[PDB]
């Protein structure tokens, strides 16, 4: 998984090479989960929206299994867990955007490139959204171009 929190328990069902999610944690998607270096990149980056949101999901799963929350909502629990879980400056970094400026990120949806011949995947960047709904997929074409090329660079490491 992301190498955070409950050691070797950041797995959905059996994935030992990473973190596997579940549909009830997703919307309009079934059995969408990643693995290998796609999820392990979070420690290297640790400043991107998906990784911060994923940590909260990890924090939720392992705070529901234990802590015996007696319907108290455990709001006292997050009182001093914001620093270790999410990058408080990252949301502050987003704070510089939505004030009548560039399309922003509300942690709603994410995009990634999938290799549909072996099973390779890449860590996602959240879809930038503005007042007028999501972007039309052409505003940041160059952003995916470098990401698509980056896969070829990682393919050299595999080779």
């Amino acid at each position: 998984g992301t190498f955070t929190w409950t050691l070797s328990d950041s797995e959905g069902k059996d994935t030992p090479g990473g973190y596997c999610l579940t549909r009830w944690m997703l919307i309009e998607a079934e059995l969408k989960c990643f693995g290998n270096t796609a999820v392990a990149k979070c420690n290297e980056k640790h400043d991107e929206e998906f990784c911060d949101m994923l940590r909260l999901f990890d924090f939720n799963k392992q705070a529901i299994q234990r802590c015996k929350a007696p319907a108290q909502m455990s709001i006292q629990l997050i009182n001093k867990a914001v620093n270790a879980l999410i990058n408080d400056q990252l949301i502050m970094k987003n704070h510089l955007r939505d004030i009548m400026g560039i399309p922003y990120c509300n942690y709603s949806k994410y995009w990634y490139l999938n290799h549909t011949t072996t099973g390779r995947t890449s860590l996602p960047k959240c879809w930038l959204v503005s007042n007028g709904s999501y972007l039309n997929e052409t505003h940041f074409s160059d952003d995916i171009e470098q990401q698509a090329d980056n896969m070829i660079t990682e393919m050299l490491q595999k080779e």
Partner: antibody
Amino acid sequence: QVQLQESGPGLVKPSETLSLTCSISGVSTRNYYWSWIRQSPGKGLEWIGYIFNIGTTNYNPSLKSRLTISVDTSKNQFSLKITSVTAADTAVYYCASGFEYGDYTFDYWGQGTPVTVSS
Amino acid sequence: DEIVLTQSPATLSVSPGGRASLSCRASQSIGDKLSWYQQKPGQAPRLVIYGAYTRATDISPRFSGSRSGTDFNLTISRMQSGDFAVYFCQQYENWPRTFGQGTKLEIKR
């Protein structure tokens, strides 16, 4: 989100062919479990069948069998082909699928259109 | 290929803001692979509860379900607006994918 529309031959004659055309807009065709469902007055719904990619096309085991549901992977539109229409076949048809991959949801439901047996 | 679907025969009308106890009993081995669907007058049905009793995409938090091996119960805590509609339960452990007769939620006079 996936948007679906359908238009069909409201005029039907007993014991002749019948073909609908469900529409898929803004989404691909492969890796989707397109399904056919109809509702008839006086009886509950019945799962008519599913068409997945080009191979497994199970047609409602032991109930009707002859359904010959086909998918046209050229304009993202699949159709139906009934045989030996009976009086009970008067119903309202719908086409739906799951969360873009799956076989137990049937979330995106189309508008549908009623069909009646007339002579 | 049948799996008897007895879902509160006739009707289960409740007072506004009341509690409903829609049920769907299973006569064959289903386990926890049961989904619920809700259909308004007009339009097409939309799922409400998938899996066993987990709330699906959208859907108000009031909706919930329970599991008892064979006796499956759908519960409404605090109804509001025009929630009066028809409901169905669906089985998907096997591959007949049959549907049930359903039940209509009438409005108290």
